[PDB]
Every structure is written in C-alpha cells, then in structure tokens.
Design a protein around this motif. Structure first.
Motif, short mmCIF file in Angstrom:
data_model
loop_
_atom_site.label_atom_id
_atom_site.label_comp_id
_atom_site.label_asym_id
_atom_site.label_seq_id
_atom_site.Cartn_x
_atom_site.Cartn_y
_atom_site.Cartn_z
N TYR A 242 8.97 2.80 26.58
CA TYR A 242 9.71 3.41 25.48
C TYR A 242 11.10 3.82 25.91
CZ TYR A 242 10.59 6.40 21.37
OH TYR A 242 11.11 6.95 20.22
N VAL B 167 4.96 -0.83 14.30
CA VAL B 167 4.88 0.53 14.83
C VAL B 167 4.64 1.49 13.66
CG1 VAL B 167 6.16 2.41 15.92
CG2 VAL B 167 6.22 0.13 16.91
N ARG C 190 13.17 -7.26 16.19
CA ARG C 190 13.15 -5.81 16.19
C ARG C 190 12.52 -5.28 14.91
NH1 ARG C 190 18.48 -4.50 18.39
NH2 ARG C 190 19.22 -4.39 16.21
N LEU D 112 8.74 -5.75 15.05
CA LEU D 112 8.13 -4.73 15.90
C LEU D 112 8.10 -3.38 15.21
CD1 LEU D 112 6.80 -3.77 18.40
CD2 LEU D 112 9.02 -3.51 19.47
N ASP D 113 9.19 -3.01 14.54
CA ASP D 113 9.23 -1.69 13.93
C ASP D 113 8.30 -1.57 12.72
OD1 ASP D 113 10.81 -0.64 15.80
OD2 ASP D 113 12.71 -0.89 14.73
N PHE E 105 15.41 -2.77 24.37
CA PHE E 105 15.18 -2.80 22.93
C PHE E 105 16.46 -3.14 22.17
CE2 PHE E 105 11.44 -0.46 24.27
CZ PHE E 105 10.46 -0.97 23.43
N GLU E 106 17.60 -2.64 22.64
CA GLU E 106 18.86 -2.90 21.95
C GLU E 106 19.23 -4.38 21.98
OE1 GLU E 106 20.40 -0.82 20.04
OE2 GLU E 106 21.88 -2.34 19.50
N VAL F 28 4.37 -0.50 23.81
CA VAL F 28 5.80 -0.18 23.72
C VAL F 28 6.05 1.32 23.52
CG1 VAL F 28 6.45 -2.49 22.97
CG2 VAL F 28 5.89 -0.74 21.24
N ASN F 29 5.03 2.06 23.06
CA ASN F 29 5.13 3.53 22.99
C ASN F 29 4.96 4.23 24.34
OD1 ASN F 29 5.61 3.67 20.26
ND2 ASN F 29 3.55 4.33 19.68
N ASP G 279 15.85 1.73 26.68
CA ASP G 279 16.70 1.55 25.50
C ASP G 279 17.56 0.29 25.54
OD1 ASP G 279 15.67 3.91 24.50
OD2 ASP G 279 17.45 5.11 24.94
C1 LIG Z 1 15.82 5.65 21.47
N1 LIG Z 1 15.05 4.46 21.85
C2 LIG Z 1 13.64 4.62 21.50
C3 LIG Z 1 12.85 3.40 21.93
N2 LIG Z 1 13.40 2.23 21.27
C4 LIG Z 1 12.82 1.55 20.23
N3 LIG Z 1 13.65 1.05 19.30
C5 LIG Z 1 13.14 0.40 18.23
N4 LIG Z 1 14.00 -0.08 17.30
C6 LIG Z 1 15.41 -0.25 17.35
C7 LIG Z 1 16.14 -0.27 16.18
C8 LIG Z 1 17.52 -0.44 16.20
C9 LIG Z 1 18.18 -0.59 17.41
O1 LIG Z 1 19.54 -0.76 17.45
C10 LIG Z 1 17.45 -0.58 18.59
C11 LIG Z 1 16.08 -0.42 18.56
N5 LIG Z 1 11.84 0.19 18.02
C12 LIG Z 1 10.95 0.66 18.94
C13 LIG Z 1 9.57 0.45 18.75
C14 LIG Z 1 8.67 0.91 19.67
C15 LIG Z 1 9.10 1.59 20.81
C16 LIG Z 1 10.43 1.82 21.02
C17 LIG Z 1 11.40 1.36 20.09
C18 LIG Z 1 14.80 2.03 21.64
C19 LIG Z 1 15.59 3.26 21.23
#
Ligand SMILES: CN1CCN(c2nc(Nc3ccc(O)cc3)nc3ccccc23)CC1
Length: 470
Positions: free
Chosen positions: A311, A332, A325, A328-329, A317-318, A305-306, A314
């Motif tokens: 990556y 990471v 989420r 996953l975070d 991921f949203e 995902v990196n 967006d």
């Molecule tokens: C600017 N981008 C960077 C990539 N990306 C990632 N978001 C998240 N977390 C998240 C938290 C809150 C949100 O409202 C939406 C996403 N985690 C990631 C983990 C690994 C790789 C990319 C992301 C999307 C945003």
C-alpha cells in the motif's frame, strides 16, 4: 386440542431417563412444531427422536452442530439408550391375564408399543441414516464409532425395521467404497512458459487468463469441500483444529499463502518498470477472477494491495495506466463499508461463483462470542441450542454455492504449482512480514521523490498477452 385423550402409560424415569417430566429445568422453547431454545442433552435427544411427530429441521441442525455440546461417541450411546425402551411393569390385572394364557396384551401395553416404542425407534433409525449420509466423516475419523454403530444395527430385531437397518447398511457400504463437460471448455492459454515446463512457471511467465482460471478451479474445489461442522463452535481456532476443520483450514491457508505470494511478487520486483508490470498483471488476473465470479480471488488481490508493505508504494500505483487503476479501485470499493457493494453483487450473479469466505468466518466468530453456550439454571445449566441454530443459519448460506462446477479444464502442472506455493520459505509469518516491509522500504524509501534505479532481473518481455482469449 378440544378434548384431552388418555395419557400413555410409560416406564419409570428411574429405568428410562427420557421420560423424566418436561419442565423449565430441562427443556425450553422459543416464542406448527415448537422451536427448541435449549435443554439437557437428554431432552434434546428425546425431541430429536420424539414420538409425536417428525422434526426434520431439528434433525438437520442437530447433526450439523451437536459436536459443540456432545461427543460423537456420546451421541451414539445416547441414541442406543433411547432405543432400548423398557416396557412398564405389568399391572396386577395384566399378570392375571398373561398367566391365564391366550389373552390379548393389555390395551395400555398395545398403545405404548404402537404409539411410543415403534415411532421412537424408527426416528432413531432415521437419525442414524442422516448421520451416516451427511456426516460420514465422524465415522472416518473414529473407527470404533462406526464399528459400534454397525454392531448395534446388526442387533436390531423385527421385520418392521429391516428395511431401515438395510438402508443404513447400504449407505455405509457406498461411503466406505468411495470430470465431464456439457459444452467444450475453452483451450488452455499459454504465454512464455510452455506446456510441461513447470520449472519455469512464475507470475509473469504464465498466462494471466490461465492463472486466474486455474486458481479459480483450485479455490472452487477448496470451497466445495468445507463442511458446516468445521465452522461450528469456532473449532478451527481451537486445540483439535487439524482434525475437526481440515478443509476449512486448507481454504484459509490457501488464501493466506496466495495473498502473501502476490505481495512477494510485487515487493521483490526491485526494478521499477518490472514492478509496475507485475502489479498490472495482478490487476489483469483480478479482472479475469471478476469475469469468473471468483470473488474469493478478487478479494485476495485487494487484500494484497492493502497490505502495509504494498500500500505504501505510491510511485508504483501512480505509474499504472488509468484504465487498470480504475479497475483495481472498483474492486477495492467492493470491500468498503463492511463489504456493502460486494454483498449486493453476490446476491445478483449467476453460478458458477466462488464467494469471499472471510465474511462467513467473521460472522460466525461474532455469533459464537456474542452468545452463551449454556442457559443458566439453579440446577444443571441447559445447552443453548438457539445459539447453534444461529450458527447453522450462517453455514447454510455457505452451502448454497457449493454445487457449481466451472466449465474450465484443469492444467495439472499449473494446479500443482498453485497448490505448492510457499512464499514464506523458511521464515515465520512474523519474519516474512518484516521481510516484506523492509524490502518495500528498500525499493521505495520514505520521502523519496523518485524510486531509485534497480537493475532488471529477467530478460523476457514485460508486455502482457492481455486477457482476451484466442
Ligand atoms: C496514497 N496512496 C495510497 C495507495 N495507493 C493506491 N492508489 C489507488 N488509486 C490511485 C488513484 C489515482 C492515482 O493518481 C494513483 C492511485 N488505488 C489503490 C488501491 C489499493 C491500494 C492502494 C491504492 C497509491 C496512493
């Protein structure tokens, strides 16, 4: 210590190299056994088989690392040279006594045979024993090496060593010749793809629990097979890497291919809902990797995902549900600040586990780069052994996790599926990298406020069976 005893009478260095006088020009120590910093290979061999005492830590480290300063055939020649010790020239008085007949051998000769020859020869046989026990691949890779060794030990005389020789033979016999559960493993989990239907296997049709299990079994097996010498001297990055580091390369290549496969699954899912479901499924697989202490797998997914092609998605991921989420975070975050949180998690967990392998490779590369192979001298430069010891310290850490079997049953078709993954197809890694990025740009163009509509590819439910076993 509190009295100097009479020196042994040794053969001359002109007939036996190893008795050349120790000096700073041929052997150096660190600052109760002295710790060797470096030396000529002759002096390293002498200390490897030293007459005054055993040195098991040195024997172990030497056998793990020697290929970075000495060839296997060369080591065997040196040990044979060490073994064939000539006796000092008899003195004039010695010659009289011998000719007189029925006189005991000289006191000096008796001491030499007992205190020098026999201990050195036994230490050599000990080295042979450890060599074939723990590094038999040297002999598998080189048939003449084994034939030379076997021929040599057949030539050894005297009952004092027959125990040792036969012991070496026995180990060689066992080497040349060459799953149970204490408690029932959980049942194999199936989703859309059913047993035997391996043609239909894919990320979304297999069960996410079982994907994680089977990949963990595979990665555990790959990890377990890596020998420390495959890491020494950065040999996996050099000309003969395929011969010297086959298990390490298999492991690295698995990680590369699996990471690229996760990326491919995500970016090739052009339909937005499908893609969100794919990423969600990959996070579920990560959860099960985490539950299984397979941090190799966890960080493969973090790596995926990196990647620059993933990556940047967006919108995808949203659209993830907040709970996935967060999961996953948190994963990471294990990798952030030079894997700070990963490292504390590793030290606490209980076996079985599969460590993240990348951090060992990085540290070994730094250590190889940051230390010279030689100690500079006015004459012949000395081998820097302390450098090898530092590398062996790192490889020792890898070994502590290699004897931890998982209580999970292998699924043979799924195993073959993951062994045979080929995301790149006919493309070069460069070509495939560009392909992923351009596909990413297609499915979520730069400055697009909403991801364009692409038709669904599959007809099956996107709904996950979840990660709770049945
Ligand atoms: C600017 N981008 C960077 C990539 N990306 C990632 N978001 C998240 N977390 C998240 C938290 C809150 C949100 O409202 C939406 C996403 N985690 C990631 C983990 C690994 C790789 C990319 C992301 C999307 C945003």
């Amino acid at each position: 210590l509190y009295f100097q005893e009479q020196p042994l009478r040794l053969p001359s260095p002109e007939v036996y190299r190893f008795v050349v006088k120790d000096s700073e020009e041929n052997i150096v120590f660190e600052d109760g056994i002295p710790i060797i910093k470096g030396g000529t290979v002759v002096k390293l061999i002498e200390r490897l088989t030293y007459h005054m005492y055993a040195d098991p830590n040195f024997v172990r480290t030497f056998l793990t690392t020697y290929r970075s300063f000495c060839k296997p055939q060369e080591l065997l020649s040196l040990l044979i040279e060490r073994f064939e010790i000539p006796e000092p020239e008899p003195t004039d008085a010695d010659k009289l006594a011998i000719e007189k007949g029925e006189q005991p051998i000289s006191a000096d000769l008796k001491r030499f045979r007992k205190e020098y020859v026999q201990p050195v020869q036994l230490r050599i046989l000990n080295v042979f024993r450890h060599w074939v026990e723990h590094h038999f691949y040297d002999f598998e890779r080189d048939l003449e090496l084994l034939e030379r060794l076997e021929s040599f030990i057949s030539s050894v005389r005297g009952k004092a060593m027959k125990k040792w020789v036969e012991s070496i033979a026995k180990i060689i016999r066992r080497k040349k010749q060459a799953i149970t559960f204490e408690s029932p493993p959980p049942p194999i989990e199936w989703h859309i793809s059913k047993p035997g239907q391996f043609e239909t296997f894919d990320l979304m049709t297999l069960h996410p629990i079982e994907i994680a299990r089977q990949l963990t079994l595979l990665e555990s097996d790959l990890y377990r097979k890596v020998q420390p010498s495959e890491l020494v001297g950065s040999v996996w990055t050099k000309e003969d890497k395929e011969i010297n580091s086959p298990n390490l390369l298999k492991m690295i290549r698995h990680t590369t291919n699996l990471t690229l496969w996760f990326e491919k699954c995500i970016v090739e899912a052009e339909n937005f809902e499908e893609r969100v479901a794919v990423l969600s499924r990959i996070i579920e697989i990560l959860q099960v990797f985490q539950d299984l202490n397979n941090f190799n797998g966890v960080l493969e997914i973090v790596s995926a995902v990196n990647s620059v092609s993933v990556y940047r998605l967006d919108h995808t991921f949203e659209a993830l549900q907040e709970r996935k989420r967060k999961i996953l975070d948190e994963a990471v975050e294990l990798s952030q600040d030079h894997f700070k949180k990963y490292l504390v998690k590793l030290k606490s967990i209980n076996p079985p586990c599969v460590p993240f392998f990348g951090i060992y490779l990085t540290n070994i590369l730094k250590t190889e780069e940051g230390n010279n192979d030689f100690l500079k001298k006015k004459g012949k430069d000395l081998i820097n052994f302390s450098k090898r010891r530092k590398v062996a310290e790192i490889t020792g850490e890898i070994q502590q996790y290699q004897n931890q079997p998982y209580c999970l049953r292998i699924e043979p078709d799924m195993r073959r599926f993951f062994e045979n993954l080929n995301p790149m197809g006919s493309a070069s890694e460069k070509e495939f990298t560009d392909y992923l990025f351009n596909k990413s740009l297609e499915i979520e163009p730069r400055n697009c406020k909403q991801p364009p509509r692409f038709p669904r590819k599959s007809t099956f439910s996107l709904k996950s069976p979840g990660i709770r076993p049945n």
